Write an enzyme that holds these catalytic residues in place. Structure first.
Site, PDB file in Angstrom:
ATOM      1  N   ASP A 255     -44.104 -76.259  48.212  1.00  0.00           N
ATOM      2  CA  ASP A 255     -42.797 -75.613  48.020  1.00  0.00           C
ATOM      3  C   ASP A 255     -42.924 -74.376  47.149  1.00  0.00           C
ATOM      4  O   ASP A 255     -42.372 -73.332  47.478  1.00  0.00           O
ATOM      5  CB  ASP A 255     -41.839 -76.594  47.367  1.00  0.00           C
TER       6      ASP A 255
ATOM      7  N   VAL B 176     -37.753 -77.714  45.448  1.00  0.00           N
ATOM      8  CA  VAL B 176     -39.108 -77.469  45.060  1.00  0.00           C
ATOM      9  C   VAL B 176     -39.648 -78.733  44.429  1.00  0.00           C
ATOM     10  O   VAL B 176     -39.462 -78.966  43.234  1.00  0.00           O
ATOM     11  CB  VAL B 176     -39.177 -76.279  44.151  1.00  0.00           C
ATOM     12  N   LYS B 177     -40.294 -79.553  45.260  1.00  0.00           N
ATOM     13  CA  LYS B 177     -40.861 -80.838  44.838  1.00  0.00           C
ATOM     14  C   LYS B 177     -42.357 -80.717  44.565  1.00  0.00           C
ATOM     15  O   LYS B 177     -42.923 -81.475  43.788  1.00  0.00           O
ATOM     16  CB  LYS B 177     -40.651 -81.928  45.909  1.00  0.00           C
ATOM     17  N   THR B 178     -42.989 -79.745  45.205  1.00  0.00           N
ATOM     18  CA  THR B 178     -44.426 -79.721  45.344  1.00  0.00           C
ATOM     19  C   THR B 178     -44.977 -78.294  45.352  1.00  0.00           C
ATOM     20  O   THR B 178     -44.316 -77.382  45.870  1.00  0.00           O
ATOM     21  CB  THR B 178     -44.758 -80.463  46.620  1.00  0.00           C
TER      22      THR B 178
END
Lengths: 465, 122, 122, 466
Positions: free
Chosen positions: B15, B10-12
């Protein structure tokens, strides 16, 4: 009651050869319709099974087969040609629409068999099955292929009548009373008409064992020797080329084993309770690419005993004076043939050109052309890019308006273009490009622009100063 | 060689939309991917008004049903109602200085949406 | 005196929407009002892109669920999707020049809707 | 104590103050907070199966009160309190919501006085006005009340309780000191009325001053005059609590009503309806009424139930970020805990709320005449009042005057709805349905004297002094 109403009203005449053998061949379907119209026209779901290595052969197997050259003497090639080119703006047959480097569809096929011949010393005949909407335009057209390394021949299929949906009475009264009143009854009509023409007699007569049928607008439908020998070693009378199904091809037809025989299940045959299972491409993994290899002798026998009888496709349509067009599919006939089965090909041999989007693809640096065949670029690792051109791009006129210089796209995954958009010389489209231009605007993409992974929107006019 | 299952970075906030959606049931601290979901996750490219978590919550306070999505792209200043469903490919792109309010319980499937729609509590 | 039961006039396509809706069941050539419906009927004021009947079908090919709606008033160039639900007061007003596509399945309730919005088959 | 409760009683250990130990404040907060968490365990929502509709005894129609009595002596006992804890930020105002000019220069509070001034004079009586304030308003109200020095009323104000707001995550009493930031407290709702009514000692003083019933109304309700016929009905049927109910219009649903539950009449709010059933509740056809918060409460009975601590109301856990948690209660909910307590329908005449500048236009119009602090509706006007829905450039009061400096003649108007940036001229007349909607970016100047009737108005239009 609807029976004698049809057969009496169909019997009215207003010619040297009695076109009745068709009007009667019709009655056979038109009647059958009523019978099925009532009860179940949905195969028992509970009886369907997934094919043995017997019944659907993977390419891994075929891949290593001889690639025999000396059996082209048994091969005759056919392309289905009853399709018009209107849905692409064009007029006349679809097959004569420029596809690549000034080559129409027809041209490309001729180039290929010509190559087959020249390289191998063999006189393979090409066969264009027309319709009334194409015949004459194809007859004069074909004559251009005089003095070639190709023995080209055409023929026409059946001119079935449309029926009034509500009244259930035939549309025409006379042999020609409007050209709107006839319809060609689908590529299931192939055999029946291959017979009425006599190419069926001629092909056997001249030592042709197998027809290699394909759609007009399929550009990957080359002659695969590796398959030809498989087909002959097995002595199977009918082979259907199947390719993996992806997200975008859930409702295409597929092949199944069913109560002893292998048949083609289309969506119409599925109980309305089950399509949420039919479309799971984990459970139904191929579809009928419509490349059909077919044993002519087997066709003769089956026609003669009237054993060939495919599923009824109603297809309701409209025209201004609703109507019904009972028609059929060659693909579905596969059950009636002995030894019949399918073979899983790579998507290569499926390259339909339905839409100017398809047209951008096949016209691009994705393919080199060679002796009438699109070779996909070696660097291209995996699936074709997904091209969704919008509506100003529907007709071929518009397409050429906006893309007179096919952009370099060898590195594209997804391109979507919506609205009124014009594309310069030497554009490159990498990865994902989304160009969406609002109502009443216009956008001019400037020469030699490299669009890679972007959303472009706005209103840019570029004017020759 | 594992399945992508054990890779869910979960980078963004893109995500974030994914893991927060009907794609996953939660169970004893683990995202179980929905059984019906046949193959690869949908591709979610939310645009820049969606970068900070504040903005994300501003515009998607009601994670849309997306169990049947392949590609969603949202560019520009876009607000999403209660009970949106996104099937297949959705492209919502809203130009500079505009705003678009996707109305409650809309089923967007295979479309490009663009324009300037304001929805106001009457 | 007699109740409106027997004054059901269709002067206007705005009237055509009322009698086409789930607000009525057709029995023996008669539009019988729903049992649910315990008031006056809703006030529907479709603007003029709805005057001629070809115009109205172009725009409302799928009659919205209007059973809990009081006052609907729509203005300018508007196209309603499949399975739209109207509730309370719905004022959609698209101004000259523009056009609004109301997404399929959208469900509007006590809301003023305005602007441009174009929805296109991808 | 419990684990999370001994952590909060530890904050009661955690909480320059000579004999002013706000322990009274802290303790009352403890009982609520502990139970809030206890009720956090179970479903805390009345059983729908056992909710039944009130019978003529529990909810009496107006006609029944109407032609009955008329007794002046009654005023000897009646007292009038005005809930005054509201700030006016939602109407764009620094201060007590009740000091906003509502009509012809008069504030809410002015009108409160005027209305009661005139009550005292009409029967040569002395009924007192009681202004229950909160820590946000108390400061201003005692100053603002000083103006009526030498009027015909005895205005007496008192503060309610100060309670500590909490954190949504850590669930710990947010502040630290008797006053760290002011934006860290909260008034515990108008259910907190009773405690601080007797903690101030207004309960005693009022009983001692010889008074036996409070007539309770909101700050922002202009309709809530003193209804003698009610004060009588309440005193003959010797009821200890009367709630006033008015007919729910299409746009009233969310409001709560009185029901019959296990043989008692109690107040059902949406929060206490289970999610499977909310829609049935909101159905106006099944719930003809709702609470106007015009309450007549027997003072004697308050003492009884307070000293025998039984006064127990539902917890509204409203949350605000300054996420945080505020535990508050409502005055109306206590109704069940009173002997002979029942409801009474009344016409909207006496439900005239000003929540919103849209409401401000209604009460400012020719639709009303101002007599003796009361907005009497025109004789002409024989329907429901018009539905005015001004959009948001009208939310704050500076915004509204900017835009409607000259109140339009709205006497023949049904439905007005205006949206975006719109300025109305002098002498504008609205009729039937008027939908003016100016879209983002633009602004519309509606010319002076213009007269709109059954019309949708849209676009740009700028009008400028030549």
């Amino acid at each position: 009651v609807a029976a004698s109403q049809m057969r009496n009203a169909l019997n009215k005449l207003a010619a040297r050869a009695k076109f009745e053998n068709e009007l009667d061949s019709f009655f056979t379907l038109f009647r059958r319709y009523l019978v099925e119209k009532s009860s179940r026209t949905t195969l028992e779901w509970d009886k369907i099974k997934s094919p043995n290595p017997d019944e659907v052969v993977k390419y891994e197997i075929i891949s290593q087969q001889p690639e025999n050259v000396s059996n082209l003497s048994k091969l005759a090639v056919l392309k289905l040609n009853g399709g018009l080119g209107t849905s692409m703006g064009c007029v006349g047959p679809k097959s004569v629409i420029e596809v690549r480097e000034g080559n129409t569809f027809l041209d490309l096929s001729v180039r290929q068999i010509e190559y087959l011949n020249r390289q191998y010393d063999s006189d393979v005949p090409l066969l264009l099955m027309n319709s009334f909407n194409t015949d004459k335009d194809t007859e004069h057209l074909i004559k251009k292929y005089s003095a070639n390394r190709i023995r080209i021949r055409s023929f026409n299929q059946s001119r079935f009548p449309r029926v009034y949906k509500d009244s259930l009475l035939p549309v025409p009264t006379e042999y020609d009373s409007p050209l709107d009143a006839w319809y060609p009854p689908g590529h299931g009509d192939l055999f029946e008409s291959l017979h009425v023409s006599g190419e069926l007699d001629a092909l056997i007569a001249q030592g042709r064992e197998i027809l290699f049928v394909s759609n007009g607008d399929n550009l990957g439908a080359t002659v695969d020797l590796k398959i030809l020998n498989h087909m002959i070693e097995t002595g199977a009378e009918y082979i259907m080329e199947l390719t993996d199904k992806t997200r975008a091809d859930v409702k295409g037809g597929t092949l199944i084993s069913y109560d002893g025989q292998v048949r083609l299940l289309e969506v119409a045959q599925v109980p309305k309770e089950h399509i949420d299972e039919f479309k799971n491409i984990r459970k139904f993994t191929n579809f009928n690419t419509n490349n059909l290899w077919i044993n002519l002798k087997a066709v003769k026998r089956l026609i003669e005993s009237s054993n060939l009888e495919m599923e009824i496709i109603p297809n309701q349509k409209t025209i201004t004076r609703n109507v019904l067009q009972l028609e059929t599919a060659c693909g579905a006939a596969i059950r009636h043939f002995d030894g019949a089965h399918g073979v899983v090909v790579p998507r290569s041999r499926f390259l339909p050109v339905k839409t100017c989007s398809d047209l951008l693809l096949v016209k691009s640096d994705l393919f080199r052309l060679e002796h009438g065949s699109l070779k996909l670029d070696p660097s291209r690792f995996g699936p074709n890019p997904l091209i969704k051109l919008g509506s100003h791009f529907k007709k071929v006129s518009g397409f050429n308006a906006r893309i007179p210089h096919i952009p370099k796209i060898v590195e594209l995954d997804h391109l979507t273009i919506t609205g009124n958009v014009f594309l310069g010389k030497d554009v490159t489209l990498r990865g994902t490009v989304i160009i969406v231009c609002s109502d009443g605007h216009k956008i001019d993409i400037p020469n030699g622009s490299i669009l890679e992974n972007v959303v472009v929107t706005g209103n840019l006019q570029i004017l020759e100063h």
